Each structure stands twice: as C-alpha cells, then as structure tokens.
Design a protein around this ligand. Sequence first.
Ligand SMILES: *[C@@H]1O[C@H](CO)[C@@H](O[C@@H]2O[C@H](CO)[C@@H](O)[C@H](O)[C@H]2NC(C)=O)[C@H](O)[C@H]1NC(C)=O
Ligand code: NAG
Ligand code: NAG
Ligand code: NAG
Ligand code: NAG
Lengths: 49, 341, 244, 49, 129, 129, 108
Amino acid sequence: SRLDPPEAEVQIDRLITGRLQSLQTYVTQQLIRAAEIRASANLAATKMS
Amino acid sequence: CVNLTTRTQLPPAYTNSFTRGVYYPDKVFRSSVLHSTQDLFLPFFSNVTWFHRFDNPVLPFNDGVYFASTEKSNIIRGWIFGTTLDSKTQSLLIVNNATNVVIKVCEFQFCNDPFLGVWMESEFRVYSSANNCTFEYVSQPFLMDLENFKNLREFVFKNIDGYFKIYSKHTPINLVRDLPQGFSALEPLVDLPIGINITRFQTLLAWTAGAAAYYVGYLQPRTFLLKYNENGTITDAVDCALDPLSETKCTLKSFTVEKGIYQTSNFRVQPTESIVRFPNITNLCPFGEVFNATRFASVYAWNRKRISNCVADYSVLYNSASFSTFKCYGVSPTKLNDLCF
Amino acid sequence: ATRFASVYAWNRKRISNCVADYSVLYNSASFSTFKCYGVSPTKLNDLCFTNVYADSFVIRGDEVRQIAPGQTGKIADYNYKLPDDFTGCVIAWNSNNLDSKVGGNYNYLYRLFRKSNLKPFERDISTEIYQAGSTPCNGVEGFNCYFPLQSYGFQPTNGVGYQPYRVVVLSFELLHAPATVCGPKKSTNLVKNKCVNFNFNGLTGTGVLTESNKKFLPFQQFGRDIADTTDAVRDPQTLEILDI
Amino acid sequence: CTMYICGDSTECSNLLLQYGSFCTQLNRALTGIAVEQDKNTQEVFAQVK
Amino acid sequence: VQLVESGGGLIQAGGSLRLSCAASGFGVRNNYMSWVRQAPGKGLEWVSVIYSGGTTYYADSVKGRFTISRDNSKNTVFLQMNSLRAEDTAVYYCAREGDVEGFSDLWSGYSRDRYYFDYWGQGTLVTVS
Amino acid sequence: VQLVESGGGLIQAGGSLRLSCAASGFGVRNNYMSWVRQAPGKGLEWVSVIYSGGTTYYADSVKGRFTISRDNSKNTVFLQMNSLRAEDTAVYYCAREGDVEGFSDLWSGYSRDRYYFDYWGQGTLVTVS
Amino acid sequence: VLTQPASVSGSPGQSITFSCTGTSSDVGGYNYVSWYQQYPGKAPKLLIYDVTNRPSGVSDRFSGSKSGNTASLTISGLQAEDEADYYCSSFTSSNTRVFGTGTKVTVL
Ligand SMILES: *[C@@H]1O[C@H](CO)[C@@H](O[C@@H]2O[C@H](CO)[C@@H](O)[C@H](O)[C@H]2NC(C)=O)[C@H](O)[C@H]1NC(C)=O
Ligand SMILES: *[C@@H]1O[C@H](CO)[C@@H](O)[C@H](O)[C@H]1NC(C)=O
Ligand SMILES: *[C@@H]1O[C@H](CO)[C@@H](O)[C@H](O)[C@H]1NC(C)=O
Ligand SMILES: *[C@@H]1O[C@H](CO)[C@@H](O)[C@H](O)[C@H]1NC(C)=O
Ligand SMILES: *[C@@H]1O[C@H](CO)[C@@H](O)[C@H](O)[C@H]1NC(C)=O
C-alpha cells in the first residue's frame, strides 16, 4: 500500500530476501525438529510394536 | 471492391478442437524433456466456431487466433490486420506468391471491402494510393493455385514483443469435415519485425467458388508443458488449465500420474465489493495554512504545525509540478492519497 | 540519422543478421554520458545478442537523465516508460551544434498528461482529447478538455539542463532466441577432439567439441539438456551440428 | 511461500518467483512433513487392518 | 520571450490578408494560441484561439469567416481573413495563454486551462477601408 | 582561443631569428603543434611540426637547418632560424592541429592523428633580404 | 459583454472600489476571471489571474474580487504611474471569452 514499482522492486526485493531467509530458517529448523519428532516416532513405533 | 450479398445466412456451427493449436514456442532444441511454457495456445477440446456456398463473415480477434484450413483448390489468399482494418491503422498485407511471396507493411489506402485480385490474372483491386512504406520482405517464388483433401495451411497470428510471428505446417489429412485426431506442432517460418497492435482480421477467399473450408479457434494465456522427444519433435501437450487432471500433469511434469495427493493450485474467495471507510469529518486539513504561509520559521527555531482530525487532500501535493525537488523517502512520492496517517 | 522521431512516437529500427562493430561506440568520447545498465559500458564487443533495439529520441527541459529502470516523472513515465527490468542502456550527448535549431526546434512533441500513465514500451500516437472535469466533451475541447501533445521548447542557449541530450536506447534481450547480431571478432578455425575455450554465437565456455548425431531442424540452432544447460550447437559458418 | 511472503499480492508473488524453486522446496518439504505425520501416525496406530 | 507580428495593411473592403505571428522562446504547442482584437479605445473582444490541436472556436459575431491554422515547421500561426466587415477593424494581438507552471505559481499542477494571458507581441493594426 | 606570434623582422640575407608563438586557452601538448609558411600568393606549404613530444620532422627542401623546441614553462614554441635561404621568405603560421574531439565530431574517439588544422594565430611575415 | 465603471480622478494612498457587472453564465457561476493593465501603445500586461492569485513583478497592493454577477477591485495606495485602464477578463463563457469596457483612473 506504501511503495510504487520503480523503487519498490529494489526495496521490496531486499525485504522479500530477508523474510525468505526467515521462512527458510523456520522450515529448516522445523525440519530438524521434525527429524527429532520423526526419530521419536520411530522410537514410538518400535515401542508400539 | 464489390460487396457480395447472394449469401446464405445460417448460424455458426461448432466442432471439437481436439489436439490442435500447439506451436514451437521458441527456436531452441530440447530432447527427452518436458518443458513448461506460458504463452498463447489453443485450449484442448475448446469450443471452436466452425464455418463452411461461400461462407466467410467478419470474425473477432481477441488475444490471437489459430487458423487452419483443409482445402483442395487453394482458395485462401491472405489476411487484413489492424485496429479498424479500414486503412485507418497500419496493416499487414499478404498477396499470393504467384508474382512473389510478398508481405508489405506499407501504409495502404484500402477500399471499403478489400480483396486481392486475379484462369489467368487480370484484375488488381487491392489499393489505389500507396505511400508511407515502412517494411518489405520477399520470400523465394512459388505458386498457389488460383482456381479427402491434400494440402493443409495453418496460421497463427501473434503480437508479442515487437514480432508478428507466422507459423505454418503442411500435412496429409483424411477427414471430410473436421480436424483430425493426432498431434502436430507449428514450425516458425519467418520472424516479421513489426510492432503493431492487431485486434481485428478478415479472411480473403477465392466468378465461382471452390471446395474448401477453414477453422478458427481462439488463444488465451495458459501454461503448457510440451514434450520433446529424442528426435526433437513435439509429440503431445497438456493444457494444464483445462481440467484438474491436466493441472496435476502440469505440476508433476509428467503425462502419467501415480496414486497420491497432489497440490496443484490454491483456492481463494475473491472480493466482490470494494469497501472504503475513512473518518466522518470531511474538513480540509490545513496543509494550505502550512504551505501558503507568508513567513516560515528559520532553520534553528523551525516551527511545528501539527495536523490532526481531518482528511488531507494529498492530491494538491502529488499532481503539482511547482515543487522542483520532490525526492521522497519512506513512502512513494506520487501515490500518497491511499493511506491513513 | 538526419532527423529522429519525437519522444511520444519514437522510432524503432531493429538490427539483425550482421556484425555489430561496437568499437565505434566504446572508444568514442563525443558521447557525453555513457552510463550503461545491463551490460558493461566498455566491453560490449564480447557478447552476441538475440535482438537489439534502438529507440532514439530527444529529451530536454527536466528529466535530462531520468530515463532509467526504476525512475518516474513527466517525461520518463507518461511518454516513454523504460521498464524496470530493462536490460541495455542509454547513450546521451548534447546536440547543440546541429539538432538544436538556430531559433528552436519546435518539432519534438512530448505529450505530457495523456490519460493516466504508460506501461513499458508502447508507442501511442493517439490524440484523443483528455477530459478531467465536465464529461460532455466528445472529441471536442471545452472547459476541462485538453489536446495533450504540447511540443518541447529548445533554444541554442537553453542551458545544460534544457540542453537536448540525444537519447539512443540500445535495448538488448539476451535470452529470447538464437543470437543474430554481434561483435567484430577474428573467427578462428574449428578444432575437434581437444580441450578448448569456445564462443559459439555468444555461448561461451570451455570444453571439447565432438561430432553430433542430433537431427536439428533447419531453423533451430542449439540445444539444452534435462539440466537446462547447453549441450549442442550448430556451427554458424557451416550448418553442421556439434555436441559440446 | 507465496501466501506467507507475498500474501494476496500478484506483483510480489512474481518478484518471489525470481528465486526459482526455493518456494517449491519449502512447500514440498512441508507437504512431506504432513506426509511424515500421516505415515508415523499410521505406523503407530494403523498397524492393524 | 518575444513575439513578432505581421500582416496588417491598408486594404479596400472585402479583400484578403494573411496574419503571421512567429514566436521566439516558445511554440504554438506549449500554450494556447489565442486571437484578440483591440478596437481603438474599446475592450479586448476575444476573436479566436488555436489550442495545442484542432479547434474552430470563434466569437458569435464572426462565425464562418475566420480560418485558423499553424505551420509548426516554422512556428507560425496563420489567421487567413476573408470577407472583411466593419467591426474587424482593430489592432490584433496574438496572445500567449499562461503556459503550464504559469509564472511558477505554487498551486497549479499541469492544469493547462488557466484561462488568462501571458506576454504578447506589439500588435498589428488591421484597417478595413 | 587566441594565438600571439612574434620574431619576424627585416634582416639581411643569411641572418638568424627566433620565432615565438604563445598559445592562450591551450598548450603545445594538447594537439600537434605544426609550422607552415604561406608564401605571398601561393599555398600554405607545411614546414615542420613538433608533436606532443620528440620530433625532428622537416620538409624535403629544408632538411638539416630548422630546429624545433618548446618551453612548456611559459607554453611557448621556439623556432630558431639559422642559415637563411631564398625560399624561406614567407608569412609563417604556427598552426594548431585539430585537437582530440575536434569540434566534438561524433565519430573520432581519442584518435589524435586527425591530420587537419584547427584555428591558429595571425602569422608573422618572415622575409629574407 | 461585461460592463465596467467609467473614468474617475482621485488622491493617492486610499482605497478605490471599482465594481463591474456581468452575467451569471460566466462570472456568477464560474471562477476563472483575470484582470490586466495596459499603457496606450504597449500591449496589456498581467495584473491578477483568478483575482486572488497575484503574479510576481506586480505590487502587492492590487487586489480584486467577484460577488455574484459583479466583480470588484479593491485597489490600495494608488500612485502616479498607476493611471491605466483596468480590464476584466472572466471565464471563457462556454468557450467564448468576453471582457469589460475599462476604468481610466486619474490623479492630482
Ligand atoms: C490497438 O488497437 C486497438 C483497437 O483500436 C486499441 O483498443 C482501443 O484503444 C482506444 C485507445 O487506445 C480505446 O479508445 C478503445 O476503446 C479501444 N478499443 C476498441 C475496441 O477500439 C488498442 O488500445 C491499441 N493498442 C495500442 C498499443 O495502440
Ligand atoms: C459450446 O458452447 C455452446 C453454447 O453456446 C454449447 O451449447 C456447446 O455444447 C459448447 N460446446 C462444447 C464442445 O463445449
Ligand atoms: C504516411 O505518409 C503520408 C504521406 O503521403 C501521409 O498522408 C499519412 O498520413 C502518413 N501516415 C502516418 C500514419 O503518419
Ligand atoms: C524421426 O523419428 C522417427 C521415429 O522416431 C524416425 O523414423 C526418423 O528417422 C527420425 N528422423 C530422422 C531424420 O532420422
Ligand atoms: C492560499 O493563499 C491564498 C492567498 O490569497 C489564501 O486566500 C488561501 O486561503 C490559501 N490557501 C488555503 C488552503 O488557505
């Protein structure tokens, strides 16, 4: 709502870049935690069986 | 020009487009790959208007058209392209190769029902005055006869990035009254460098009538993944926006889809109304009292005039040119009017 | 050129299928500002272009150098909106000695306030009357009805800001098609079965050139693999297909 | 990725598309995570027909 | 800004002339090009105006005679006068309307209406005799 | 740009001179500094030229006599004249060769060859008598 | 044709109010009135466009106004060189401009 295309493409490219590293960090960190829940799930399935 | 009125008036017929309308989107070799391209293509199984007497009315041209003809005695002569198609705008004129293949992008004064003229050629009734010529190209001489089928001519009319690109393919056919099932891709012939805006066209046909028919379909911006084989021929295509199975095919880059769950797009309810609500007070904010003011405070003891509780017409700031240097950080320098502060 | 087109109806001369001696551009000093986006301002000679565009026109008054990707204003936005993804550049030099008239070339229309704005790269010769107040106007001029052209105003002693910087926009598209126009290189003999540094019509790399068995179509010049990397080229002098 | 970073914005989505398959990788990874949760729950509880 | 004028002269009733007004410092396109006649000791009764393009605006009393055109090549406004009458006897001024950013007034942004008058030439006496 | 010259005068045959040419607005370094003599009612026949550094270029008929040098401190070209002969009687012009970017011609980029002549001074008559 | 007040003579320094009549089509409704000043022989020079707005190079004492079908000039601190007719140019009245007759001031 604030920025126009001629300045917005460079400034927003910088903002998108930063937010994408933050989302990439979330998903990668979430992948490591998911690996830990997955390992727990493998423990749970073995413990289950 | 002469306006022929001894014409039967029937409504348009419709047929099934099948697998027609795929062309080479680029000039680059690829093989054993599925490549997804977003361009103007004829949709698969699209609703195509079907024309056949001496049947040739005026037709719409929207984003572009797909043209194919099945003929035995070469009646098609060329096309008129334009905005009005009545000599008011630049037009593309294609005369038959009997003289030489000629595509002339000159500025012509057309008659009000233009048509190429000609069994021996006699008449020439395309234009009278002719000046302001901007482009000419002549292809190697051939000959299109001026008086199941065997010869198919296919045309695509595009207006992309300065090029009017014409594609054609000649194949055998074995249908009497329809488009065959099977696949073919349209090869580029010549890249014509004319940046004109074409929205309208008319078909030229070739006193007696011959045995021929032509079909016109319409292109829309769609994404297609085209399959190139080892040899280099495109053998199939999927219009991924035709139906959800093609959507899955488009997402998976394959013509075979396995058992599973596939995410192909995202649904969103679209807004139907635009609701704009600002404060009830309509009093003009005193930016006038700031800018018009006879005396400003000096740079060390600068004044501070607070503005609150009104609507501020930033238009007088945005549209004005008297401000020599309006270089603006923080927010956009022009579209300030669409925010509340 | 003796005379160039105005900034609203700027000409477009496409150049293709020849050798482009960029030396006459690179080494020249008469070009006042060669501030060049997209590619290097000096080494233009070492690329092959799919297509080159040449929009040449004349701008003075304000916006003398406001023609740039990501710029706005009266001239750069409502007469010729250079796109924000623009690949290419602008040669500008004052033409006081010749293009500026002894009195004033009042022949460069610049059409301030057409309707709202312009998207990239559409030439609009449309002269419809602009309306902002009373709508009754229909191709007729009235209370709030304008004819929008209102041509430039230059004099020999205009000043550097109001001096006509002759703009020549070389707008290159490097990934559109097989390259057709480029630089004046010596061109050496073709060597096979050896490790070499190659330049095939702008495609550059290091590798070994071997005989290909691919059936290229007559108009098709090169290929790419599943990896979307180059793996085949048609030789530009003899229409033989090589794998690289 | 498009909705989170450029939510309900076509111009911003087109700017993100300039980073190629990063978005597809995050969604694929996250779809895979959802699949992993359905798979692990199905090994622990759905081990009986 | 300078405005030079020519065309006025001693003529019999019902003749023809051609008024030429060449503008230095501005063109016929930049601002509205109006026509006013100043009768000796009377008001400025507006005659005509050439806009930036395509106008046939005349006064109620002079309809269908005066013809307005421009040669933009030489920056010249032509007013071809045929079938003279009594009231046209006056000093004629080619008037430059206040161009865009009129005297750098700090309120008007590209509104070219601004229906007032900037500096003009010295005027030509056109007499019907 | 102005070029002032001095040194010419009435001397008997076989004398000696010193030609002084001072350039204001440009130096002896910017462009080639040539020497030409224009005999009364004949062409301007080139004599010699001192380049931006280190030249002993003379005409075929005057080899081994003329000596060319500069004082860059005062921006002055000296042409020391020894062992006069008949044909040297002429008006001598210190000629400024067309410098780099000659009249801002839009084709020549830093090619300082440009073998033509820019503006020069008014010339000194040098007579052998 | 807008009608203006006749010639008058007076003293420097004080305020003179000259009101000029018009019609409701141009002056009463629309607000693009401008006023000028000319010396016999020289072309008219701009004094006030829109009446409220004042171009540069003009003394600030000049002021004008409009009321209904009438336009008023509240001129202040008259001087010797000020003796010149004042011309009222209103809006172009549906694309046909009209003017007033003229007010010749005199001083002692
Ligand atoms: C190409 O031509 C078409 C057809 O004239 C243009 O579409 C019209 O554009 C004008 C003004 O641009 C509008 O007033 C019309 O309403 C439009 N539609 C029709 C049906 O006439 C199109 O804008 C042109 N494009 C360019 C780039 O010139
Ligand atoms: C095409 O549209 C018409 C409606 O005008 C419809 O009756 C017909 O079934 C459609 N054909 C196809 C193949 O969708
Ligand atoms: C082309 O030139 C002719 C001159 O014969 C002119 O009449 C015509 O209007 C021109 N067309 C355009 C589009 O400028
Ligand atoms: C193209 O493919 C067909 C079958 O795949 C093959 O018979 C033909 O020989 C190929 N083309 C050429 C030129 O070899
Ligand atoms: C602008 O200045 C004029 C001077 O006459 C004044 O009347 C007007 O009220 C000012 N603008 C605003 C918005 O106050």
